[PDB]
């Protein structure tokens, strides 16, 4: 096997990113970092959500984006979203710092290398 561990390096990269950028982020028990810029007026595991998210690497290059609202089931998404989206209501925005083990894993996919820290700027517009 070629099993690779990225938790420690992802953790140190995330804390360095929060050091260079004047940002304070709360940490979950699974290693996810999140920032609530604003709160609205909570999605569950079986809940449909519409998001205006934006995803990029630590160097700022965008790998995925949705300028208009896109509907998701919130149970088919990466674990980082499954932990971050329930933290706010409709209209709120969250900044995610998903590590690899909560994102695309140690192998990644196309356009996302394995063991890559993901950054998401997600706006929850509806929990329909």
């Amino acid at each position: 096997d070629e099993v690779k561990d990225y938790t420690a390096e992802n953790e140190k990269e995330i804390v360095d990113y929060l050091a260079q950028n004047n940002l304070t982020a709360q940490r979950t028990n699974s290693g996810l970092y999140y920032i609530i810029t604003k709160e609205g007026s909570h999605p569950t595991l079986n809940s449909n959500i519409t998001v205006i998210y934006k995803g990029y690497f630590t160097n700022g290059k965008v790998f995925d984006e949705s300028t208009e609202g896109v509907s998701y089931s919130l149970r088919t998404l990466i674990p980082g979203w499954k932990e971050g989206i329930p933290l706010l209501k409709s209209g709120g925005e969250i900044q995610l710092f998903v590590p690899a083990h909560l994102g695309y894993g140690s192998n990644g996919n196309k356009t996302v290398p394995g063991g890559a820290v993901l950054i998401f700027e997600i706006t929850l517009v509806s929990v329909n």
Binding site: N46, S47, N48, S73, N128
Partner: protein
């Protein structure tokens, strides 16, 4: 529309999880006036 298989019985869909079973196909519709050969049709061992 609300027949989207991806949103079967989520919050306001026209379909329930019964739509996935042949026996309960009729009960799988949330809407009322649904007929067994107009709105839908079922096959049990359909060949591709």
């Amino acid at each position: 529309n609300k027949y989207d298989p991806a949103t079967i019985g989520q919050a306001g869909s026209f379909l329930n999880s019964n739509i996935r079973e042949i026996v309960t196909a009729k009960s799988g519709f949330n809407n009322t006036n649904v007929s067994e050969a107009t709105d839908y049709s079922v096959l049990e061992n359909a060949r591709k």
